[PDB]
């Protein structure tokens, strides 16, 4: 990982200085802990300067993704979400959880809300319903529209995602 | 692990200077030794200022969880416990052992006191009864209610765990 | 391992004169524990050292090397058990200074030994353990021998009654 | 496995023709199914002729050993148990479960009723089933069985005879 | 395994009343050797059995199970060592009928034992071996004990002098 | 393994009915037990008819080679040894231990008496001297000539091994 | 492997009844022992009925291949060799070792005399020279022509092999 | 590995500043190179100040242990050897090679000169080098060293003192 | 790796500051590139000052051994070779390749010039003959003598290696 | 890796304008060698650059990337072979600037390519081989047919034979 200088930082530390938090790759408890630590640090530096979440994630552990979601809801800051590459499963929940008006995608990204695939059947569906309710709330779709949509094994383009309510804006340049 | 200026710390060192101790992931002896060392250290800086324990944990080794528990009870400081993600098995014992009035969860966490399925049968039950007595004391439920509940292979929402006495506050914002 | 203020937290512990024995005891754990005991003795021959024990046991000869160093140095040694002290773990707990052997209340202590050398050597080593435990608990050889045959754990108060430790502590005295 | 002629038979088939069932090596569901099939087979050939069970086992899966134990008790035949090598844990339960007066060991065998090492309550429910079985067939009290089982040790055939696990120690026919 | 005239060659050996003990001894080797000894006894209680031993040793309790069966049956047993008889191998060689323990001239014999159970059990097993070896070599316990401490092999003639075997054979007598 | 009619045998059973014993590949205890069983069996069919041992072997376990050797010396039969391919280490000891006048090789075989580089140092040398004495006896070379030759990490042609006394006849045709 | 009937044989046993010996695949000591056993059996059934060796082999252990060669030279029978697929390294030596006039190849086979790639440098070259001398003898080329040719890492077609003297005949139908 | 301050030093660097060289765990070429580098370094700082070698080793590669032995003999410094835990095989050779009067053990250590378990002649040439080294430093005859080394056993520090491997058994400074 | 004292260094760096280069363990291309880098650096610091090479090795890759050899011959510096533990196969070639009069062993070392047992047969012999010519040259023995001693799978003591020409002095203590 | 005075020793070599090509060539080695060559060119596009080669070969496309970078930069490039230069290693050796390609005396050089690459179609493997034929022809000044016949031969050359063939200019013992 390369070093940059004005002051020396490895490049990911330099991104944190810009108020950017990276969510790349599968989400597990360790990624969630490092993402949460950064969200709370950046709020500490300022309650109202926007925070940017870069998402390129195929998904990951549901409870770890919900821990990130709950922290995003908890801090006061506007949070801008940006999808590069893809946002599948828990990645798309975090993308849709950004501050309204500030959820973005680059033009070739792929977005999926279908969930892939130790605990009991009652617990798996309780978690499933929590996802149904988060998605309904942030997309402004009905529970039934969410449930039928998550049953489809397929990706959407940024513009379909925009029309469904996961995203507000599709980019190309600044 | 990103670096943050304040004066250059990795972000987990910065959490500790905020008096936050992280309990993420399975508990084993090496997790316990690190958590204990940090609790004693924060006590030595100040025996009055509260300490905050952040818990996202599926449980782990019982004796190592009991070492953390005993240290929490030993130090003078008030201890605020916070659940994000999940607090299951020993994770939820540590959450319930926070200072009364100061046990919290974020809204989408999942809490389980049922214990997961080399020592003798007498020893396994002796440990199990040590857990029954700890949970009964911090929830103020009777031993028989703790015993029947832990037989249920379940998971509870934050609001149920509040009513049961595992925690005090379910918060969404500051 | 976090950094405190510059100091990684385990080096800060050593600055308090705390030596940690967490986990299976083998030769390199023993080499590090011994290095630390001799270092702390050279800082002050008389100031107490604190040994934090959370351990399932380990290699007998490595255990006896730590034991021999503990008896060698001039310092008083406070032992503290958290979590557990099983097998060689509990030998090191029992070997602290008379009056300064402690446990927190939910610890489990065991002196039974779990199940390459000849049979005569295994028995010689076993009798060295019987003699060490008899000396520091003040029990007879026969009592130690019969107790070590029972595959069970003791609570802190029962270990206190048997003579493995002196005090079960809930809060700071 | 060599063949013996009389008709051609592998040697283990010859033994079963002798009314001998072998319980060798760890007990698991597979072993239990084969042992049970053989006990039931021999009963259907005659529910009066004795059945011989040859045991050389370190033990194994408790529920699999209980399945064999129950079948032994269910069939009408007298059952002679013979210990060669060792009978440890479930091994020694099956040996002690033979028909009274018909439980034997060769002279250099080792016998252990200590058990080695699913939810905590279920582990003790199973252990209680073993205490009740050992008490019934040895005629010791429950308290004597429990103390004996926490001792991590083997017995000689003569000690196991005194305790009630066996009736006879042999040398020759 | 070739076929001779119908008979695989190892079954033809059993027809000569030869039982092979080749290789590490474990519980299934012992179960097969015992099955064969009892089979051959039922063919003729009095006809000699021949035991071919080429073995580095193995599990002690499995070894003692074969030993106990050898002493149990009525038959005389000729032991023959080819290649080697180490540890439990050499116990079974020494345990043949007095006068009928043999070796070919380039065999190596060892009674030293190589280097999960408690230390007391390992010593009990070791003393059972001392008593077996003392009985069949006619040496005192002290002599057996000192010899087993030496990590070395003996030639056939030295094993003959020590009492492990009776005859070193080059050609058919 | 093909089957041949004569009355249906696999071809290795047919070799045995011709009084041929195969010693192919590394020698270990299980090879030795099978070779010994066949030598005794062929002796029991007839103590006078020659037995033929076919050897293509890089050597193997010393004690197992010595068991075969001792059996060869024990039985009454003349034994013809034949080397094709190679006879190295214990393989070449068995070749040299054939009945005098009846040791052969095919033309392109390679023969080595040098020994390849858990027991004590005294035991390893005791075994080594047992081999020195066996080779000296069947080649009728002196102990010191056998000792220096075996130090040479070499391989010899059939004609050299004839001159050294390892074998008697090098044949191309009947 | 399927069974055929007039009399039941697995198909490879039926091939042996036709006096066909298969050398397929890499040549090691085990293949050589089974090939040798069959060559000697078939001579036993008849001293002068031709034997057929089918070769599709990338090569293998040199000493094991020389053991097969020496047996082919030893038996009295005419031996017809047939190459299908390929004959590389030791496979091509066995192909060229057939009775003159009776070495054949199907039209798409590939033939290589280049040798691919524990013993000392002196031994590797002694073996190499044995191959040089066998190839020179059966191809009627000079040692120098063989040595320079084996240095070329390349396959020949059946007709080049015919012209070089490895083969006598290239087929297409009976 | 914790840091100690005076300047920052990992604890093993602090020990070397004390003129202490650690020989822990198996001896191989890597360990030997580091030990040798340290002995030579300490000599260059002073060829008179004693060097202390702390040994807790089951042994290891003979030639690597001989490299250390030769360096120990080569440097001019007095060398104090200290055994904690165990000194077995090459371990015990290095312990016995300390400067006379300066060879120590803690009280519960175990010491073995039996060696555990390339061409046969070369294995004995090496073993002969070890016999000569042990005879020189213990002052026993070659015949006494050879018989002692074939016994598969450990000695206590007091026995090893009688034999000439050590001079002093300690408890405290 | 322990640390030693201005300035502080790991002990292997401190060795190089003394002009000591270590060849411990099996010789492969990366060991050779490191030893070579160290030889050429030491030559640039002083072209005339001796370099010391410490050898405890069982041998290794021949071409990598020869690459060290050629560098040792290339530099202007005198090179003292020291054998502790063992110098086998390529290790003993490097030991013999030190400056005449400066090749040493401690007393209990074992020395072996026998080579242990993908390239063609002709290349293996080409490389073996290069080893014969290097050993002949630095021991002052004939080719035939070197060829016959290398067929023997044995080790030499320091004193027989001395008599054979592989080294000059067996030392027990400093001078 | 030892420190010289702070400076790990491989960084000290880069300060001498030496670039090391040790061991097998793959994309990561090529990236690091290219980075170093362009670095040294930016320090001075006239001071010679030194490539040390001890290599059995490696991935063709990654060798060709180094070759093209050597040809692209302006500096004179001296190539030095120690140990061996096989397959893509010998291409790089031969690609140094004329008059400046060297070998130490016991090196082994091979232009035969071993029987690497993602697996590829038959026409692509031959297209690559013909790229290597051309590069070797241009720098050895041999005709394509001599190059082709020579690479068919599975063998190593000595340095003096490599010098006659046009792969290197100078074989040397000392400086
Ligand atoms: C897992 C988790 C989690 C997620 C959302 C909220 C909380 C509640 N927690 C509860 C407690 C708490 C909080 C916030 C806080 O944001 N800060 C300031 C701070 C934090 C981190 C850094 Cl690096 C710098 C500054 C804080 N300083 C003392 C306590 N405290 C948990
Ligand atoms: C395992 C364990 C364990 C758990 C709970 C209590 C104790 C008792 N122990 C007993 C001894 C003791 C203690 C507290 C202590 O809290 N501090 C101050 C300190 C500690 C760590 C750090 Cl990083 C900084 C400051 C202390 N300084 C000397 C001894 N000592 C053990
Ligand atoms: C293995 C071992 C071992 C265990 C217990 C005692 C001894 C004897 N040893 C014997 C020698 C000795 C000793 C003590 C000593 O404690 N110190 C001072 C010192 C040590 C380490 C550190 Cl970090 C700082 C200071 C010491 N300085 C020179 C010699 N020396 C061994
Ligand atoms: C698992 C199990 C099991 C164990 C103990 C008793 C039963 C009850 N069972 C109940 C049913 C039953 C039984 C006996 C039986 O002993 N025999 C005769 C028989 C059995 C086996 C063989 Cl080989 C030959 C003959 C039987 N013939 C039909 C049904 N039947 C189960
Ligand atoms: C484990 C074991 C064991 C070892 C030594 C003796 C005994 C006692 N056992 C005790 C019982 C017993 C025996 C002998 C017996 O030798 N035979 C005859 C028989 C056996 C096998 C074969 Cl193939 C052919 C014939 C026998 N027939 C019914 C019971 N019975 C155990
Ligand atoms: C291991 C071994 C061993 C090696 C060499 C000699 C002996 C002595 N032994 C001693 C005993 C003995 C022998 C020969 C014997 O050759 N035969 C005839 C026989 C054997 C095998 C087969 Cl298939 C067919 C026929 C024999 N029949 C009864 C006993 N017996 C051992
Ligand atoms: C390895 C090998 C080897 C290769 C070439 C020749 C020999 C010499 N050998 C030497 C001895 C010998 C031979 C031939 C022989 O061809 N036959 C007839 C026979 C063989 C096998 C089968 Cl199935 C059927 C018939 C034979 N009958 C007794 C001895 N004998 C070895
Ligand atoms: C392997 C090895 C080996 C073992 C025993 C003696 C020798 C001879 N060698 C011979 C050469 C030699 C020596 C000593 C020396 O002890 N020192 C001083 C020094 C060494 C190391 C450190 Cl870290 C600091 C200072 C020395 N400085 C230059 C040459 N040199 C080898
Ligand atoms: C692989 C290799 C190799 C082996 C033997 C000789 C050469 C020739 N090479 C030829 C080129 C060359 C050389 C020497 C040189 O020794 N130095 C000075 C220097 C080198 C390294 C360090 Cl660390 C410090 C100083 C040098 N500076 C520019 C070119 N150059 C190679
Ligand atoms: C893969 C590749 C590649 C290979 C050969 C040439 C080019 C073209 N490239 C084209 C671009 C380019 C080049 C050269 C350049 O040599 N330098 C100077 C520099 C480079 C590296 C370092 Cl570490 C320090 C200085 C340069 N500075 C900006 C752009 N640039 C590619």
Swiss-Prot record, chains A, B, F, G:
GO CC entries: endopeptidase Clp complex; mitochondrial matrix; mitochondrion
Main subcellular localisation: mitochondrion
Catalytic reactions of this protein: Hydrolysis of proteins to small peptides in the presence of ATP and magnesium. alpha-casein is the usual test substrate. In the absence of ATP, only oligopeptides shorter than five residues are hydrolyzed (such as succinyl-Leu-Tyr-|-NHMec, and Leu-Tyr-Leu-|-Tyr-Trp, in which cleavage of the -Tyr-|-Leu- and -Tyr-|-Trp bonds also occurs)
Keyword tags: Acetylation, Deafness, Disease variant, Hydrolase, Mitochondrion, Protease, Serine protease, Transit peptide
Active site per UniProt: 89, 114
EC number(s) recorded for this UniProt protein: 3.4.21.92
GO BP of this protein: membrane protein proteolysis; mitochondrial protein catabolic process; protein quality control for misfolded or incompletely synthesized proteins; proteolysis; proteolysis involved in protein catabolic process
Tissue specificity: Detected in liver (at protein level). Predominantly expressed in skeletal muscle. Intermediate levels in heart, liver and pancreas. Low in brain, placenta, lung and kidney.
Disulfide cysteine pairs (residue numbers): none
Residues modified as N6-acetyllysine: 137
Record-listed N6-succinyllysine modification sites: 126
MF-aspect GO terms: ATP-dependent peptidase activity; ATPase binding; endopeptidase activity; identical protein binding; peptidase activity; serine-type endopeptidase activity
Subcellular location: Mitochondrion matrix
Disease field: Perrault syndrome 3: An autosomal recessive, sex-influenced disorder characterized by sensorineural deafness in both males and females, and ovarian dysgenesis in females. Affected females have primary amenorrhea, streak gonads, and infertility, whereas affected males show normal pubertal development and are fertile. A spectrum of additional clinical features, including cerebellar ataxia, learning disability, and peripheral neuropathy, have been described in some PRLTS3 affected individuals.
Function description: Protease component of the ClpXP complex that cleaves peptides and various proteins in an ATP-dependent process. Has low peptidase activity in the absence of CLPX. The ClpXP complex can degrade CSN1S1, CSN2 and CSN3, as well as synthetic peptides (in vitro) and may be responsible for a fairly general and central housekeeping function rather than for the degradation of specific substrates. Cleaves PINK1 in the mitochondrion.
Subunit-level organization: Fourteen CLPP subunits assemble into 2 heptameric rings which stack back to back to give a disk-like structure with a central cavity. Component of the ClpXP complex formed by the assembly of two CLPP heptameric rings with two CLPX hexameric rings, giving rise to a symmetrical structure with two central CLPP rings flanked by a CLPX ring at either end of the complex.
Family statement drawn from the similarity comment of this UniProt entry: Belongs to the peptidase S14 family.
Protein name as catalogued: ATP-dependent Clp protease proteolytic subunit, mitochondrial
From Swiss-Prot, chain J:
Main localisation: mitochondrion
Any single Gene Ontology cellular-component annotation: mitochondrial matrix
Residue list for modification N6-acetyllysine: 138
Keywords, comma-separated and alphabetical: Acetylation, Deafness, Disease variant, Hydrolase, Mitochondrion, Protease, Serine protease, Transit peptide
Coiled coil: none
Entry EC no(s): 3.4.21.92
Involvement in disease: Perrault syndrome 3: An autosomal recessive, sex-influenced disorder characterized by sensorineural deafness in both males and females, and ovarian dysgenesis in females. Affected females have primary amenorrhea, streak gonads, and infertility, whereas affected males show normal pubertal development and are fertile. A spectrum of additional clinical features, including cerebellar ataxia, learning disability, and peripheral neuropathy, have been described in some PRLTS3 affected individuals.
Subunit structure: Fourteen CLPP subunits assemble into 2 heptameric rings which stack back to back to give a disk-like structure with a central cavity. Component of the ClpXP complex formed by the assembly of two CLPP heptameric rings with two CLPX hexameric rings, giving rise to a symmetrical structure with two central CLPP rings flanked by a CLPX ring at either end of the complex.
The protein, known as: ATP-dependent Clp protease proteolytic subunit, mitochondrial
Organism this protein belongs to: Homo sapiens (Human)
């Amino acid at each position: 990982i390369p070093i940059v200088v004005e002051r020396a930082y490895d490049i990911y530390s330099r991104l944190l200085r810009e108020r950017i938090v990276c969510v790349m790759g599968p989400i597990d408890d360790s990624v969630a802990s490092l993402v949460i630590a950064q969200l709370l640090f950046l709020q500490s530096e300022s309650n109202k300067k926007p925070i940017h979440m870069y998402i390129n994630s195929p998904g990951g552990v549901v409870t770890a993704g919900l821990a990130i979601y709950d922290t995003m809801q908890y801090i006061l800051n506007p949070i801008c979400t940006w999808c590069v590459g893809q946002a599948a499963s828990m990645g798309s929940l975090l993308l849709a959880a950004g501050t309204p008006g500030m959820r973005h995608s680059l033009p070739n990204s792929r977005i999926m809300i279908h969930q892939p695939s130790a605990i009991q059947a009652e617990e798996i569906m309780k978690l499933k319903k929590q996802l149904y309710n988060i998605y309904a709330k942030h997309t402004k779709q009905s529970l039934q529209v969410i449930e039928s949509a998550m049953e489809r094994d397929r990706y959407m383009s940024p513009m379909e995602a925009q029309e469904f309510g996961i995203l507000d804006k599709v980019l190309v340049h600044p």
